[PDB]
Design an enzyme around this catalytic site. Structure first.
Site, short mmCIF file in Angstrom:
data_model
loop_
_atom_site.label_atom_id
_atom_site.label_comp_id
_atom_site.label_asym_id
_atom_site.label_seq_id
_atom_site.Cartn_x
_atom_site.Cartn_y
_atom_site.Cartn_z
N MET A 1 0.79 -1.29 -0.04
CA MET A 1 0.14 -0.13 -0.11
C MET A 1 0.93 1.32 -0.10
SD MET A 1 -3.20 0.87 2.29
CE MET A 1 -2.41 1.88 3.42
N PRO A 2 1.61 1.59 -1.17
CA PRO A 2 2.27 2.64 -1.12
C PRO A 2 1.24 4.15 -1.37
CG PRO A 2 3.40 1.27 -2.54
CD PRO A 2 1.75 0.78 -2.37
N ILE A 3 1.73 5.11 -0.28
CA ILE A 3 1.34 6.31 -0.28
C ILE A 3 2.18 7.44 -0.39
CG2 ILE A 3 -0.18 8.03 1.10
CD1 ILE A 3 -1.29 5.76 2.66
N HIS B 1 -0.99 4.93 -4.24
CA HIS B 1 -1.68 6.52 -4.02
C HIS B 1 -0.50 7.46 -4.18
CE1 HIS B 1 -3.54 2.82 -1.96
NE2 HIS B 1 -4.60 3.26 -2.27
N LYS C 1 5.34 6.62 1.88
CA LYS C 1 5.07 5.61 2.79
C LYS C 1 5.03 4.17 2.27
CE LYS C 1 2.54 9.08 5.48
NZ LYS C 1 2.97 9.37 6.95
#
Ligand SMILES: [Zn+2]
Ligand SMILES: [Zn+2]
Ligand SMILES: [Zn+2]
Ligand SMILES: [Zn+2]
Ligand SMILES: [Zn+2]
Ligand SMILES: [Zn+2]
Ligand SMILES: [Zn+2]
Ligand SMILES: [Zn+2]
Ligand SMILES: [Zn+2]
Ligand SMILES: [Zn+2]
Ligand SMILES: [Zn+2]
Lengths: 62, 62, 62, 62, 62, 62
Positions: free
Chosen positions: C3-5, C42, D9
Site C-alpha cells: 500500500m504505497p502512499i 496512491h 510511505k
C-alpha cells in the site's frame, strides 16, 4: 548526512514577515540543536483554516 | 486559536538530549515569530533511516 | 501487502497535464522499483506558494 | 524555485537496493514531468509496519 | 503520554457540518481504541482537489 | 472520488489488537461523517518514540 525536513501547520492569516521569520528562526533552531548543515534544512509552512482543525474533538472555528 | 504542529524529519542518530533541545528551540522559534501561545505549540520528531532518503536522485543530503 | 502512499510537495502553478503525468510516472516508478501492485499505489500532490517554503532559512519568494 | 519534496510511505521489507532504485526513479519521474532541477528534488521513504495500516477498515492493502 | 495527531486528506467540498462531525467522531475513535486522553488528541483536515490525487496512476479528475 | 487517507501519529506502545481497532474505528468515523465509500478509506498509523515529541517546549503530552 542529516537533511532535515520541517513541516509547520498553523492557523492561516500569518503576515509575510511572520512567515519569513518563522522559516529563518526554525532553521536556526534545527541547525544549532542537531548540527545539521544549514543548506540541508528545509521548511514548509501549511496554513490551516480554523474550521479544518481541532483538539479534544472541537474545531477552533466552533 | 493557533495550534501549531511542527513535524521534523531528520536522520536517526541524535541523542535524546539533542532532541530535547530541538523540541525546546523549535518551540521558541514558533512562539517568537508567530505569537502562538506556547501551550498550543507541538513538535514531533520523525527519524529517517540511513539509505531511506536522498536528493538529486542519490542517497546523500544537499 | 505494500500500500504505497506518495505525497509530493512542489511549487504551485503546475499545468494539469504536468500533474497528470507526475501522478502516472511517479506511480510507474514506485511500482517497478518495489513490486507493489499498481492498484495499491496512491499519490497526492500538494502545491506550495513560494512564500511558504525554503531551504537554508531563506524562502523561495525572497 | 521548485524544490519538490516527495514522501513515500510503504510497507517495511524492501532491500536497500530497491529503496536506492525507488529514490532514483521517483526523482526521474519528478524531473521529467515537472521540469524541476534534479538537485532540488528530495525523496524520503517512511516504512510502515505490518498491522499498522489498512484499507476498508481491515489490515490489508487494496 | 500519547499525544495523537491525526491528519485526514480527503476530497474537497465537504460541508462544515461534515467537517465538524469528522473531527468529533475521529477523536472518539482514537480515544476509545487507544485510551489516549481526549485533550491530547488533535485532528487536521486537508481537502484535496480531484486533479491533485489518484490511485493506480489515474487522477480522480480523469 | 473521495479516497480519504488518514494518518495517525501516536506514541509507540499500543498492542496490535488496539491498532486493529483503531483502524476499524477511524474508518467507521470517516465513513459515517463524510459518506466516503469504505473501500476507499485508508488509515496509516505512525508510531512516535518516547522523547521524540512535545508540547509547550517540554517532552510531555497536553
Ligand atoms: Zn549556521
Ligand atoms: Zn499537507
Ligand atoms: Zn530517535
Ligand atoms: Zn535540499
Ligand atoms: Zn504495471
Ligand atoms: Zn511520517
Ligand atoms: Zn526501511
Ligand atoms: Zn486505495
Ligand atoms: Zn472521553
Ligand atoms: Zn507500532
Ligand atoms: Zn495539544
Amino acid at each position: 548526512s542529516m537533511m532535515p525536513i520541517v513541516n509547520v501547520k498553523l492557523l492561516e492569516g500569518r503576515s509575510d514577515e511572520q512567515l519569513k521569520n518563522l522559516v529563518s528562526e526554525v532553521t536556526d533552531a534545527v541547525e544549532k540543536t542537531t548540527g545539521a548543515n544549514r543548506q540541508a534544512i528545509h521548511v514548509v509552512i501549511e496554513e490551516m483554516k480554523p474550521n479544518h482543525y481541532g483538539v479534544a474533538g472541537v474545531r477552533k472555528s466552533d
